Design a protein around this ligand. Structure first.
Ligand SMILES: CCCCCCCC/C=C\CCCCCCCC(=O)OC[C@H](O)CO
Ligand SMILES: CCCCCCCC/C=C\CCCCCCCC(=O)OC[C@H](O)CO
Ligand SMILES: CCCCCCCC/C=C\CCCCCCCC(=O)OC[C@H](O)CO
Ligand SMILES: CCCCCCCC/C=C\CCCCCCCC(=O)O
Ligand SMILES: CCCCCCCCCCCCCCCCCCCC
Ligand SMILES: CCCCCCCCCCCCCCCCCCCC
Ligand SMILES: CCCCCCCCCCCCCCCCCCCC
Ligand SMILES: CCCCCCCCCCCCCCCCCCCC
Ligand SMILES: CCCCCCCCCCCCCCCCCCCC
Ligand SMILES: CCCCCCCCCCCCCCCCCCCC
Ligand SMILES: CCCCCCCCCCCCCCCCCCCC
Ligand SMILES: CCCCCCCCCCCCCCCCCCCC
Length: 230
């Protein structure tokens, strides 16, 4: 409670934990193999985020990085979370549209580059270089968003209508929410430092819960997750 952002870390921990438990109960008894994949991916996402939020709440996922002549508090646990949860969210989208394996690898690999370069930027001690890493990570994000809109055209013709509808909604949610992350980083404690860490932490909490639990609720309530069966 010594760090003002503790309240948002505590709320994030609670919301990710509750979301995990809700998806775990909702997925009980699901037998359809396709739906099992979506429940597994989508429950694993807030479960991982729960552990990383808790690690930030308890102080383990925080480190001090010297730059700008200050000791800057950097929550590195965010990147350990996103390293696994962001490819999993992309996998949800890719499986919906029955993406080619090559497209899945392009997405997951670009996503690993996005998170890894974000982590390097977050830990870099030379201030100006932090924004070089931010730019590379943003380029990887833009590549991901490009694929989400322009890499699935060969699947549109054979796509079930409920699949197309649910994918379109989830893709829109993804572009809007994922785009905000580089802005928050750029203006917050990692970047230019014009928004204080407590407000940056609130912003990431709202984004994370929306991108994980909100996304998850939209997906797991849809009939698109079930194979077409009589
Ligand atoms: C935007 C962010 C959504 C926040 C979710 C909080 C996590 C708790 C998850 C609770 C969801 C409960 C729900 O929507 O349940 C309806 C359904 O009818 C019952 O099976
Ligand atoms: C997922 C958990 C990641 C663990 C990595 C780790 O704990 O190492 C961090 C370092 O010790 C702390 O600065
Ligand atoms: C000037 C420096 C230029 C280099 C900057 C690179 C650093 C990372 C930036 C963006 C990630 C690019 C992601 C690379 C993944 C591309 C995979 C691919 O090409 O997939 C095509 C295939 O058809 C499947 O759809
Ligand atoms: C390229 C897209 C535009 C954004 C680029 C990077 C902005 C760099 C901001 C530098 C902030 C340092 C100033 C400070 O000391 O607070
Ligand atoms: C200061 C600590 C007190 C806050 C009490 C908790 C409020 C619950 C948050 C509700 C958010 C719902 C979404
Ligand atoms: C101090 C608050 C701790 C967060 C709550 C733990 C998770 C609750 C899930 C139910
Ligand atoms: C506590 C950190 C948990 C991260 C491990 C998550 C591994 C995900 C494996 C499937 C992707
Ligand atoms: C200053 C040092 C800070 C430590 C950063 C650790 C980076 C965590 C990323 C973990 C990703 C893989 C973990 C596998 C489990
Ligand atoms: C880089 C790490 C990759 C994490 C993968 C998580 C599971 C989805 C990929 C198939
Ligand atoms: C202090 C300014 C440093 C900004 C470097 C940004 C690099 C962007 C690459 C395009
Ligand atoms: C077709 C329906 C797509 C609507 C997507 C709404 C996104 C809202 C972002 C938060
Ligand atoms: C739809 C693409 C939006 C990408 C946002 C990237 C952030 C750029 C920072 C602007 C200042």
């Amino acid at each position: 409670t010594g760090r003002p952002e503790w309240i948002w870390l505590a709320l994030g921990t609670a919301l990710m934990g509750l979301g995990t438990l809700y998806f775990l109960v909702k997925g009980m008894g699901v037998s359809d193999p396709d739906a099992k994949k979506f429940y597994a991916i989508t429950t694993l996402v807030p479960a991982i985020a729960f552990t990383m939020y808790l690690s930030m709440l308890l102080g383990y996922g925080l480190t001090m990085v010297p730059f700008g002549g200050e000791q800057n508090p950097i929550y590195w646990a965010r990147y350990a979370d996103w390293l696994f949860t962001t490819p999993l969210l992309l996998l949800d989208l890719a499986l919906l549209v029955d993406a080619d394996q090559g497209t899945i690898l392009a997405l997951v690999g670009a996503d690993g580059i996005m998170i890894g370069t974000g982590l390097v930027g977050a830990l870099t001690k030379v201030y100006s270089y932090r924004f070089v890493w931010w730019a590379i990570s943003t380029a990887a994000m833009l590549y991901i968003l490009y694929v989400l809109f322009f890499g699935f055209t060969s699947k549109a013709e054979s796509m079930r209508p409920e699949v197309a509808s649910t994918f379109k909604v989830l893709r829109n949610v993804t572009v809007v929410l994922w785009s905000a992350y580089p802005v928050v980083w750029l203006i917050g404690s990692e970047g230019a430092g014009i928004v204080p860490l407590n407000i940056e932490t609130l912003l990431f909490m709202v984004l994370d819960v929306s991108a994980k639990v909100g996304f998850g609720l939209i997906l797991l309530r849809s009939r698109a997750i079930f194979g077409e069966a009589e």
